[PDB]
Symmetry: D3
Subunit: 69 residues, 6 copies
Amino acid sequence: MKLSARNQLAGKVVSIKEGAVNGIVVLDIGGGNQISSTISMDSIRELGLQVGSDAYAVIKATSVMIGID
Amino acid sequence: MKLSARNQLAGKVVSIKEGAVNGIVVLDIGGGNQISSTISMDSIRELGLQVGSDAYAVIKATSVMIGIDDWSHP
Amino acid sequence: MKLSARNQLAGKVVSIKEGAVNGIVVLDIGGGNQISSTISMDSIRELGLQVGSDAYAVIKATSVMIGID
Amino acid sequence: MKLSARNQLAGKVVSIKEGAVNGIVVLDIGGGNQISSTISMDSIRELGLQVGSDAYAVIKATSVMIGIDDW
Amino acid sequence: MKLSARNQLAGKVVSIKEGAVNGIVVLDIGGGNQISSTISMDSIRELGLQVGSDAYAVIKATSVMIGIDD
Amino acid sequence: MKLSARNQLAGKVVSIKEGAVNGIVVLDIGGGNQISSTISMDSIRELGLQVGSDAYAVIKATSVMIGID
Ligand code: MOO
Ligand code: MOO
Ligand code: MOO
Ligand code: MOO
Ligand code: MOO
Ligand code: MOO
Ligand code: MOO
Ligand code: MOO
């Protein structure tokens, strides 16, 4: 699928924290940046995610806030 | 403030699209990545954002989905 | 791309209301259900959406609330 | 109450997966479509949800993305 | 309707900023606190919201972050 | 940090329910209102949150719906 989400950032899974119905996937997206994703355990399984998997961090633009110092 | 949001990514503003009540801020966060943020025009003004401003893309972890390529067969 | 979002509902575009930076797409997913999506104008154009387009309403499970009468 | 959320889709609970502080509710909304919802366990209990309950999937329009087959 | 959203804060509309497809509704919830809501113009119209209307700010718990003084 | 989020509501923590990857923090913001926040256990710990902590409920304007009677 091609998705409307403005942010689709390629990266590699560096850690997966398994929970009860959700888990937290951490992706190394390059440039010294990592992104954490809290998604359902069902999806972690269905997408076959493991540490070292290639994946994408997908974020709708309306979910992104801006901060400054 | 220190914020719970797991994702707080430093970057530089490369473009701002001004709308009616919202606008879209594009941040270059390095490594060839850009992040687009759709936020209120009021916030854009109050934060003094301009092209070239240093800022952060702030994303709650529950807002981030994971994708894989179409030819991966889990 | 294949996505973690638990909800990926096939439907046809029945209307697009254009805004300044966002627009609102209405998708008929069948059975008398329609879904409204508020997304960037950039995305509406990039996906080539028009009345009658085949598409999907994509919703993260953590964005779905449950209501009762 | 009546809510601004543009999407309020009637359906029946087909499953509830209990987690620690959240659970996942699946609703059959008709037309062969199901909606999965990740909400607090407290809300699952407070709303009296069980398999067979009548309910609604409620989604804010700004939470909905559009995808296409990009063949 | 009764909703799973854990946050439902009563207040009065103090302002509505109309946009193109969205508008921004501000509610006075008391205590010198206001909540701003960015929602569709269609909903603002359908709910009959005007300055002075009694309403509620409704927020899913997964949408709320916590911040602290550093 | 200063944040674009239009809603930044001061309050005191009155409850913490710990989960597997998430927890739920309840903040009393005054006027008889409490705001519940479902966030990662990691952040709950990193922010040092306990019953009695002073904190803020932070909500993006696009996450706030309006309801009426
Ligand atoms: O155009 Mo989006 O789907 O709001 O990022
Ligand atoms: O721990 Mo968060 O605020 O869900 O990213
Ligand atoms: O939270 Mo999900 O598993 O991306 O719908
Ligand atoms: O295009 Mo808007 O109405 O400023 O979100
Ligand atoms: O008008 Mo809404 O509450 O953004 O779906
Ligand atoms: O109940 Mo959890 O901590 O969201 O899996
Ligand atoms: O996640 Mo909730 O339990 O709908 O606020
Ligand atoms: O959409 Mo905002 O201006 O980050 O609350």
